[PDB]
């Protein structure tokens, strides 16, 4: 009975909209499109494996 199973709730948003003064905090990421009219669509999460 000491092999109990904890349950932790995990959450993450999907597809938010950033504030209009957009910015970056690191370089060397150049996405070949318009960075002002850019929009999230996905949520690339990581599995257990």
């Amino acid at each position: 009975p000491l092999n109990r199973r904890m349950q932790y709730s995990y959450y993450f948003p999907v597809g938010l909209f950033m504030p209009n003064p957009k910015y970056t905090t690191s370089a060397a990421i150049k996405m070949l499109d318009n960075p002002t009219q850019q929009l999230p669509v996905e949520a690339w999460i990581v599995n257990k494996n």
Partner: protein
């Protein structure tokens, strides 16, 4: 909050440089994992705790 990413570019930048990554980009974002269990990450050999 779990590991998310609105693009694979931000999760590659997080896998490469752990300390100095970009948590917020122009039109994307990434939320690091602050879970009570330290899930070790691996994308090839770029080991990130």
């Amino acid at each position: 909050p779990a590991l998310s990413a609105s693009s694979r570019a931000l999760i590659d930048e997080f896998m490469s440089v752990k300390q100095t990554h970009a948590p917020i980009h122009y039109g994307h974002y990434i939320i690091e994992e602050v879970a009570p269990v330290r899930r070790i990450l691996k994308f090839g050999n770029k080991v990130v705790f």
